[PDB]
Each structure stands twice: as structure tokens, then as C-alpha cells.
Write a protein that binds this ligand. Sequence first.
Ligand SMILES: COc1cc(N)ccc1C(=O)N[C@H]1CCC(=O)NC1=O
Ligand SMILES: [Zn+2]
Length: 104
Amino acid sequence: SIFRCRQCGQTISRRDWLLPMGGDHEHVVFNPAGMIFRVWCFSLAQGLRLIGAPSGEFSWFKGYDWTIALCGQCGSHLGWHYEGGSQPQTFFGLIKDRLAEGPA
Ligand SMILES: COc1cc(N)ccc1C(=O)N[C@H]1CCC(=O)NC1=O
Ligand SMILES: [Zn+2]
């Protein structure tokens, strides 16, 4: 039911907050460095630190700009916050294998 940071246990999100963007909460993507991510979209998340200002470059999600989202506790890269778009205006794309799932 709750997702925590796999490295340190910081409280991050909830299964209840999964968001099906374009029909699926799961999206498999690669960046310009060829890294493949299995990204789960969430309407809401907490315990992150968003670093820098948003960028639209190479955005996986049409009409959204991204900011890097670290674990606010341990600084591990957990995904991205997306903003600037429509319906919803914002959401989080978190890297599923960087989270741990477990009880409330
Ligand atoms: C400018 O993107 C990068 C450049 C690099 N040299 C290395 C990595 C990234 C990177 O992971 N970009 C991601 C951000 C999220 C997004 O939606 N799409 C991406 O492609
Ligand atoms: Zn952490």
C-alpha cells in the first residue's frame, strides 16, 4: 500500500495515487544516455527534493516539462516531477525499481 525509497525508507507515495497516463500507470522509456526506466506515474508524492528549474528537452510526456526528483532524505534519484501540461497540469514519474512497497 505505501511506497518508500528503497535505499533509506523515506515515505514517497501510495498505490492509491497511481495515475494511468495515456491508459497505463507504467511507461518504459529511455533517455539520451540509453538508460531504460520503468516509470510509474503518480498523481502525488512526498518526501522528494525537486532540483533545478523545469526543462522540456526530451520529455517523455507530451506537453510537460520535467524536474529531477531526488529522495529528500538520501539524495538517490527516484524520478521526475512533470509540470506545465494539461489534465493534469502536474504529476510524478517515479522509477519503480527504486521504490519499496509495503504496509501502511
Ligand atoms: C536531457 O536529458 C538527459 C540528458 C542526459 N545527458 C542524461 C539524461 C537525461 C535524462 O534522463 N532526461 C530524461 C528526463 C525525463 C524525461 O522525460 N526524459 C528524459 O530523457
Ligand atoms: Zn532515500
